[PDB]
Design a protein around this ligand. Structure first.
Ligand SMILES: Nc1nc2c(c(=O)[nH]1)N[C@H]1C(S)=C(S)[C@@H](COP(=O)(O)OP(=O)(O)OC[C@H]3O[C@@H](n4cnc5c(=O)[nH]c(N)nc54)[C@H](O)[C@@H]3O)O[C@H]1N2
Ligand SMILES: Nc1nc2c(c(=O)[nH]1)N[C@H]1C(S)=C(S)[C@@H](COP(=O)(O)OP(=O)(O)OC[C@H]3O[C@@H](n4cnc5c(=O)[nH]c(N)nc54)[C@H](O)[C@@H]3O)O[C@H]1N2
Ligand SMILES: NC(=O)C1=CN([C@@H]2O[C@H](COP(=O)(O)OP(=O)(O)OC[C@H]3O[C@@H](n4cnc5c(N)ncnc54)[C@H](O)[C@@H]3O)[C@@H](O)[C@H]2O)C=CC1
Ligand SMILES: Cc1cc2nc3c(=O)[nH]c(=O)nc-3n(C[C@H](O)[C@H](O)[C@H](O)COP(=O)(O)O)c2cc1C
Ligand code: SF4
Ligand code: SF4
Ligand code: SF4
Ligand code: SF4
Ligand code: SF4
Ligand code: SF4
Ligand code: SF4
Ligand code: SF4
Ligand code: FES
Ligand code: FES
Ligand code: FES
Ligand SMILES: [Mo+6]
Ligand SMILES: [S]
Lengths: 949, 243, 148, 234
């Protein structure tokens, strides 16, 4: 496999013509711009380096990578010296030895000898380059130092005390060499210039412009840490616990980017998690959540033994597996005989692997005898899988994340990648700072707009709901003018339909000059943006929940694909229509069924040819009718004819709308099993409980947004004794199915056998190749990094006439304001995994981003308590005045349960997939003191229900 | 904004760009990629002051004055302890002997001259014995020295070479981007080493030499590569002051 | 009122290429130093980060981090001015004011500049924007006389 | 290929009947006399060791390979503890962590902080077992040391100067931990008892009965060297 993975080369990889040279008498062939250091690395001949890292561009600060080159004068650096043909370089002479020793002498003259009781012992790039070069003596009787607390005549002014304000890493500048990798990383890699170098010379100290890191613009992500060689910036878990020995590759249980990590381990104790320099998803970068937040797996509040109640009012009872499963299966069979098999159901968890997903949908189809399964994707990116299906042929992405590197423009509708998908936003900013352009269509100023060294930017700050009107107007502009690509239309799409679409869109009613009234966006700006999008060579669209979660989501997605096909930004690296999937293995989940209308492979359920295959493979009779969806489940159970539910890894209460309704529907249910780690809000209405396992204890795969199948490994051991697939088969066999699995490799084999695309998938492949894109059959064996590269899947694109339907959640006197729900970087959706960490620092309370002018007349001030008097409920919350949002718009966050936010949220949903209207809700923000009438009862219930016996 | 190092081209155009005057490494030249990533022609004033005169009066005329390699007139600035200071523009080939004893008389204090520092503080301390040394880039670069902006100060017998050699490193210390190690630390360490020498230690001079050498060979810019010249010069020319 | 001045300054340097240095110059000329209260808006206007600004401010010497006395006295400490007796001058002056080199006050502020172009008029200084040369130990009396 | 080649297991290989046991929750099958340490090595679970080497027989000097075993009292050593069937052993608890830190504390209380300018940097089995266990502080304000040339009131009597009489290796006892691998090797492996331990306790210093190594019965063969972890013999 590549060397980039295991070895830290010096400089980044360059593209160009081959170039031959002789490093220390060894022939090497490498691209042109490639340095001497990287080449020498590729050739095995190692050169002493401290300030050079691949993540970033090289800088001649250490001066320790000096080499003698024929045809040059002196001892130039390899970090900065690009190769040239016929170049002959010498790496180790007496001269160079002397100089390097001298340089290290100078370094160490200002370094403490706290090795042997420093955190980074065994992992300091200074120590090992001080032993390499051959340092044996330091001759400078130093007086001016940075580490010495006590100088002569008194305290050292140069001494800067430690800074442990951050709960995850610490800054001890006493040990700082000024290589500046920290800076270079926060500025090149991440893209938030939080670090600088205060001073000129010896007085130069790294610093964030603030008393402490926390107060700063530094969020986290330990890039600064991953790059610091000298324990100045160090993880605390390495201070407390020792320095690790082994490494194990896994993936993050978040964000759907698939940021691959390598967990460093000292025995069985997890010391830290550090990115791998693998995965096209993350090239050695991360966020705070993945890098640091893995402490939920060791929280006291985690549950390790099954529990049964037999009545929700009654307390729990810690119980073993057998009798629990017995009780479970008994009640299940009872209900199955009484109300029918359609009176059951499951709820898969994206957070889980695809293997467990497959098992669960089997359990729901093969065993229970129904099609009533579902997952989190009904509410995140279902409309997507309808629109892109009606247009292209796939309910999935179009490109990788490496494509953005090649784009010349980014159009972002309904997304906040800095909080949602950080590692993607980094790569986006890398391109923005390199000239590319940006259009943003949110009503809420996102931090992607205020990125540093940004190029050009347009911002369409519209009114939420009006997202299709804007697209239609864009298309109207493009068609009124003549900017679109005709070749593309004639070739890859149809013409009969293009004519109709053009004649529809060309209407002056869908023009920017009219929509400006209802939309709120200006006209000229829109025209400009459209021209800019249509003009660019390679443009790319990245959309999220601003389009989907609405009364018109499928419609919008369709409109978007229409634009993308019209302009010609499809079937090429640098362009596409990329939806930003959220949870891990949402894609995997949807691919492995987890929908009540399909089988694994997005194959409908009414297809006899497929039902036959599966009846044969599972040896059971299946149903041809499609099952219920979550809202349908709840309405049913309220009405009856639904009595059972097996909730895997999901919080249907805090993370679903019309909380009152869902609660009332979850209560009227003779049995609702739970299969989470902790005692969630869902378990307040439960009868049963089964522990699950974390991604650290599991083994399997995760299918991310770019269709990549990352592999998940086992580092710890299941505290509850059994992972989730184990539990699933336990339950199924206890019911009477009779499966026998000993390793999920067998399951992946089953899948490869049944569904197409995964036919070539094998764990060994994932281990060797590193990762795979799931369309991997005998055709496209390596994988399919880009979809629709040669003609569309259905064969021909399809143009569809979209129109703007006025939403039913319009505003009035008593509900004048609007509402929006969204996200934060530190905390995940409900924070069951995250509130149980030290990330309650950046965000420990949910807050309401209200506008000032919309607050003055109300009497709001920052830090005041308010109430959201909506139609579907009422809630109390702390306020925050900000010009981020537009007037007549409000923004909330649902990460905290102490605040009940989805109770405000209304039942209104998409037309196709019934994804709810989260991003729109008519509310009334007013001032108040008494918290609420609902929150009180909720807490009462939760307290009277989370008690054990 | 008060930073010597900003005289370097890279740092200069870094400072133009709104950033901090940290010298850049030189895989790319400013001519290829300088100001705002664009090609830029960076030059001294004297080099741009001759351009019009050149193109107008004819290149061949400008080609007349000077030595074989160094062509054209140069200004010699003469300051410090010297009777007739100021400026003297002339063709190369003139000795500092003449320029300092004949042309500019002697010293303000009437005392003799013990030192004459060509170039700035990045330049050596030529004594009287080097009066047989005409001005040109080549001979001065070869005779353990430098001629850049043709700077020329003077010191009389009442000077202490130790103090000056110290001020050199003190300069390189106070004036330093702080990018490469051999000027950050090397300087503020040499300033201690020289003190140690002033004390009388013998484990210092070789230490000093090694330091100077690594500063020459390793440092990125000149300010930490030429700094050693003053020192070594004051030491090898004026040993009667360095115990 | 400071915000207004700052906004004015920023408006005056709009669209320029690499306008951080000029803007800072002007901000300093206005107040007398770069207050940390004015690291942010600059960044907001220029699309930078507070950090970059503070780093620039920290690097360069001519940008005051704290204000000076009513008067200011820069005194060359370079080669030439050293040659023609700058030490003695320095001593006399710092004895007069009672303020050593680099040590400031509410009254005055003595500091170093490391050249002024007065290399022939060796002993040179800048007192309150007025250059002085040939500073023998007598003119210092007149220097201090106009300067309490 | 074998692990013996690349990895330094703890104790030598033994022959006997197969024996099953559970090292830190991992099943292992190995000969009878085989130790816990070697088994744990064979199983991938590494245990902190300084005085144990395969070349020689084990001795409980460092006390850093302590483990909690079900059915035993206290924290016995793995180097000296032969396996038995059905034995379940724990390798990393809080207790053991504390004790190991304490032991390394004691060690380093009598060691110079010349890492970063010592020869065996990157190749010292003390440094890497001091970072492993998680040492972060030393609390003993030591007065009696071996490395310190200058004590209070004058020279250190305990200080023994270097010995570069040999042209191939050097002996700097200032950095000696008394693991005695050197001795054990010259006496078990080679077979010429040239090395001994002169003294009783803190005053115990390795030594050949002679002013210098050369004058001794030591020929060469750097077994003594190949085994010294701490750059004393280098
Ligand atoms: N740290 C962290 N990372 C996460 C998550 C988290 O909670 N924390 N969530 C995970 C998951 S499950 C999710 S869904 C993904 C994706 O999550 P995203 O796709 O990032 O969705 P949001 O951040 O809620 O909001 C998207 C933007 O569109 C705005 N918007 C609101 N109404 C409209 C409208 O009518 N039109 C338009 N054009 N825009 C509108 C919203 O206000 C917001 O600015 O991220 C995943 N990653
Ligand atoms: N107002 C509002 N509401 C929203 C949204 C919004 O933006 N605004 N977003 C919607 C969307 S984008 C989505 S994705 C949903 C997501 O919202 P949720 O469905 O709440 O998903 P998570 O927060 O991951 O928590 C699900 C549960 O599974 C548990 N779990 C984690 N890992 C494992 C594992 O390995 N095995 C097992 N057995 N269990 C595990 C977690 O501990 C947690 O309790 O929210 C939706 N609701
Ligand atoms: N280790 C050390 O002691 C070092 C000392 N120095 C010395 O400093 C002195 C002057 O400093 P600089 O002006 O920084 O470097 P320099 O003198 O090498 O360059 C001269 C000028 O011409 C330009 N130039 C150079 N090569 C060119 C090419 N091939 N095409 C077009 N333009 C080109 C440069 O941009 C620069 O402006 C030089 O004599 C150099 O040797 C510089 C680097 C390190
Ligand atoms: C520390 C330092 C200071 C410098 N100061 C100046 C200066 O004041 N003026 C100048 O023209 N070049 C100066 N240079 C040289 C520049 O690097 C560059 O060579 C010069 O500006 C180009 O002008 P020329 O083409 O006329 O030589 C300095 C270099 C260094 C290393
Ligand atoms: S940072 Fe590295 S070199 Fe410095 S004390 Fe720690 S381990 Fe030793
Ligand atoms: S953790 Fe990340 S954001 Fe914070 S300073 Fe380091 S690189 Fe910058
Ligand atoms: S904090 Fe670490 S990475 Fe940054 S300059 Fe100091 S040693 Fe280098
Ligand atoms: S960016 Fe997303 S996938 Fe990557 S570490 Fe963060 S949460 Fe995990
Ligand atoms: S020698 Fe000094 S001034 Fe020159 S580049 Fe190095 S650190 Fe900067
Ligand atoms: S023997 Fe090992 S621990 Fe001791 S100073 Fe040398 S490298 Fe450090
Ligand atoms: S080198 Fe000498 S002392 Fe060491 S083991 Fe061999 S014979 Fe014994
Ligand atoms: S000389 Fe080496 S092997 Fe012998 S006791 Fe000392 S440290 Fe151990
Ligand atoms: S080694 Fe290439 S400059 Fe640091
Ligand atoms: S040296 Fe002080 S005037 Fe130029
Ligand atoms: S570790 Fe077994 S006794 Fe030294
Ligand atoms: Mo989601
Ligand atoms: S999602």
């Amino acid at each position: 496999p590549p060397l980039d993975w295991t070895q830290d080369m010096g400089t980044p990889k360059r593209e160009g013509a081959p170039v031959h040279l002789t490093i220390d008498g060894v022939e090497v062939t490498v691209p042109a711009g490639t340095s001497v250091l990287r080449a020498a690395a590729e050739a095995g001949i190692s050169i002493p380096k401290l300030c050079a890292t691949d993540n970033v561009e090289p800088v001649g600060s250490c001066r320790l990578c000096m080499v003698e080159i024929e045809g040059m004068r002196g001892t130039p650096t390899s970090c900065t010296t690009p190769v040239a043909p016929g170049m002959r370089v010498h790496t180790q002479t007496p001269q160079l030895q002397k100089l390097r020793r001298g340089v290290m002498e100078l370094y160490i003259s200002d370094h403490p000898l706290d090795c042997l009781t420093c955190a980074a012992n065994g992992d300091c790039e200074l120590q090992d380059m001080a032993g390499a070069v051959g340092l044996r003596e330091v001759r400078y009787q130093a007086k001016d130092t940075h580490f010495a607390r006590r100088d002569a005549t008194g305290p050292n002014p140069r001494y800067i005390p430690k800074d442990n304000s951050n709960p995850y890493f610490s800054y001890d500048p006493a040990k700082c060499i000024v290589c500046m990798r920290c800076v270079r990383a926060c500025e090149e890699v991440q893209g938030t210039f939080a670090l600088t170098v205060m001073g000129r010379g010896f007085d130069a100290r790294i610093s964030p412009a603030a008393p402490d890191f926390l107060s700063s613009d530094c969020v986290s992500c330990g890039a600064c840490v991953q790059a610091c060689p000298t324990a100045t910036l160090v993880e605390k878990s390495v201070e407390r616990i020792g320095t690790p020995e082994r490494k194990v590759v896994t993936t993050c249980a978040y964000c759907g980017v698939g940021c691959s990590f390598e967990a460093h381990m000292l025995g069985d104790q997890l010391v830290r998690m550090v990115p791998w320099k693998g995965g096209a998803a993350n090239r050695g970068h991360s966020c705070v959540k993945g890098r640091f937040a893995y402490g939920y797996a060791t929280h006291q509040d985690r549950i390790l033994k099954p529990m049964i109640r037999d009545k929700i009012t009654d307390p729990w009872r810690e119980v073993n597996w057998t009798e629990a499963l017995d009780f479970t299966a008994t009640r299940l069979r009872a209900l199955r005989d009484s109300h029918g098999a359609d009176a059951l159901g499951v709820i898969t968890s994206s957070r889980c692997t695809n293997e467990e997903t497959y098992l669960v949908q089997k359990l729901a189809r093969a065993v229970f005898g129904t099609n009533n399964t579902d997952t989190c994707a009904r509410v995140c990116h279902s409309p997507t899988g309808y629109g892109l299906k009606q247009t292209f042929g796939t309910s999935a992405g179009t490109q990788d994340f490496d494509s953005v590197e090649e784009t010349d423009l980014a159009l972002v509708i309904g997304a906040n990648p800095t909080d949602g998908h950080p590692v993607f936003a980094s790569r986006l900013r890398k391109r923005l700072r390199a000239g590319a352009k940006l259009i943003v269509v949110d009503p809420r100023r996102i931090d992607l707009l205020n990125t540093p060294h940004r190029g050009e930017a347009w911002h369409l700050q519209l009114k939420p709901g009006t997202n299709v009107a804007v697209m239609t107007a864009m298309a109207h502009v493009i068609v009124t003018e003549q900017i679109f690509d005709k070749r593309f239309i004639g070739d890859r799409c149809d013409w009969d339909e293009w004519a109709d679409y053009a004649e529809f869109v060309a209407n002056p009613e869908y023009a920017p000059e009219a929509v400006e009234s209802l939309t709120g966006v200006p006209a000229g700006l829109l025209r400009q943006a459209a021209r800019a999008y249509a003009a660019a060579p390679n443009a790319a669209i990245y959309y999220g929940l601003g389009v989907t979660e609405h009364s018109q989501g499928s419609t919008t997605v369709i409109a978007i694909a229409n634009l993308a096909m019209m302009t010609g930004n499809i079937g090429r690296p640098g362009v596409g229509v990329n939806p930003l999937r959220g949870q891990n293995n949402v894609q995997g989940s949807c691919d492995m069924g987890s929908f009540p209308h399909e089988f694994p492979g997005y194959r409908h359920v009414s297809d006899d040819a497929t039902r036959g295959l599966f009846e044969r493979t599972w040896g059971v009779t299946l149903s041809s009718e499609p099952g219920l969806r979550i809202p349908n489940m709840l309405d049913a159970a309220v009405e009856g004819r639904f009595k059972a539910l097996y909730v895997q890894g999901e919080d249907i209460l805090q993370s679903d709308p019309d909380t009152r309704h869902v609660s009332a529907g979850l209560a009227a249910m003779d049995l609702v099993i739970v299969h989470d780690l902790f005692l969630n809000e869902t378990a307040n209405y439960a009868h049963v409980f089964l522990p699950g396992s974390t991604f650290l204890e599991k083994d399997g795969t995760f299918t991310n947004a770019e269709r990549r199948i990352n592999r998940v490994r086992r580092v710890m051991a299941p505290k509850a004794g059994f992972a989730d697939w184990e539990v699933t088969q336990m339950l199924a066999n206890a019911l009477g199915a009779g499966w026998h699995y000993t390793h999920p490799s067998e399951i992946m084999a089953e899948i490869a056998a049944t569904t197409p695309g995964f036919a070539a998938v094998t764990y060994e492949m994932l281990d060797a190749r590193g990762s795979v894109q799931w369309p991997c059959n005998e055709k496209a064996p390596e994988g399919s990094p880009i979809m629709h590269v040669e003609g569309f899947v259905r064969g021909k694109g399809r143009f569809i006439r979209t129109a703007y339907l006025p939403t039913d959640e319009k505003t009035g006197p008593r509900f004048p304001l609007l509402l929006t729900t969204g996200r934060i970087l530190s905390q995940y959706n409900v924070g069951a995994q995250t509130r149980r960490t030290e990330n309650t620092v950046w965000h420990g309370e949910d807050r309401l981003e209200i506008h000032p002018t919309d607050a003055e007349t109300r009497g709001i001030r920052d830090g005041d308590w308010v109430r959201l008097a909506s139609r579907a409920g009422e809630t109390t919350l702390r306020a925050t005045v900000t010009d981020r949002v537009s007037p007549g718009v409000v923004y909330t966050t649902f990460h905290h349960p102490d605040t009940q936010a989805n109770v405000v949220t209304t039942d209104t949903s998409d037309w196709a997939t019934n994804c709810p209207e989260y991003k729109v809700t008519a509310v009334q923000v007013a001032a108040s003191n008494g918290p609420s009438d609902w929150q009180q009862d909720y807490a009462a219930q939760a307290a009277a229900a989370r008690r054990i016996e | 904004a008060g930073a010597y190092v900003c005289g370097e081209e890279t740092s200069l155009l870094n400072s133009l760009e709104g950033k901090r005057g940290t010298v850049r490494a030189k895989p790319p030249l400013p001519a290829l990629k300088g100001l705002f990533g664009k090609p830029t022609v960076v030059n001294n004033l004297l080099s741009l002051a001759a351009v019009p005169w050149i193109i107008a009066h004819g290149a061949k005329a400008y080609e007349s004055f000077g030595m074989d390699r160094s062509r054209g007139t140069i200004p010699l600035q003469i300051g410090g302890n010297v009777k007739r200071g100021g400026l003297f523009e002339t063709g190369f080939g003139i000795t500092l002997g003449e320029l300092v004893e004949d042309i500019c008389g002697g010293t303000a204090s009437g005392r003799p001259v013990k030192a004459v520092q060509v170039g700035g503080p990045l330049g050596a301390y030529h004594p009287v014995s080097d009066y047989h040394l005409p001005f040109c880039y080549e001979q001065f670069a070869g005779q353990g020295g430098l001629v850049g902006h043709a700077g020329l100060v003077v010191h009389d017998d009442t000077a202490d070479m130790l103090k000056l050699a110290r001020f050199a490193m003190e300069f390189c210390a106070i004036e330093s981007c702080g990018t490469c190690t051999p000027c950050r630390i090397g300087a503020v360490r040499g300033v201690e080493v020289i003190d140690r020498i002033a004390a009388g230690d013998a484990s210092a001079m070789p230490l000093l030499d090694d330091l100077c050498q690594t500063m020459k060979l390793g440092s990125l810019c000149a300010l930490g590569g030429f700094t050693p010249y003053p020192v070594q010069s004051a030491i090898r020319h004026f040993p009667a002051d360095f115990p | 009122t400071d915000t207004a001045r700052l906004r004015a300054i920023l408006a005056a340097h709009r669209g320029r290429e690499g306008a951080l240095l000029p803007i800072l110059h002007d901000v300093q000329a206005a107040f007398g130093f770069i207050p940390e209260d004015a690291y942010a808006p600059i960044a907001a206007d220029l699309g930078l980060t507070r950090a970059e600004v503070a780093g620039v401010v920290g690097f360069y010497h001519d940008f005051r981090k704290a204000p000076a006395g009513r008067h200011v006295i820069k005194l060359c400490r370079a080669e030439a001015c050293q040659a023609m007796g700058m030490d003695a001058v320095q001593a006399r002056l710092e004895s007069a004011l009672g303020l050593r080199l680099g040590d400031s006050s509410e009254a005055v502020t003595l500091e170093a500049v490391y050249c002024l172009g007065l290399c022939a008029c060796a002993p040179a200084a800048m007192v309150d924007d007025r250059l002085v040369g040939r500073l023998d130990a007598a003119a210092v009396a007149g220097i201090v006389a106009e300067l309490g």
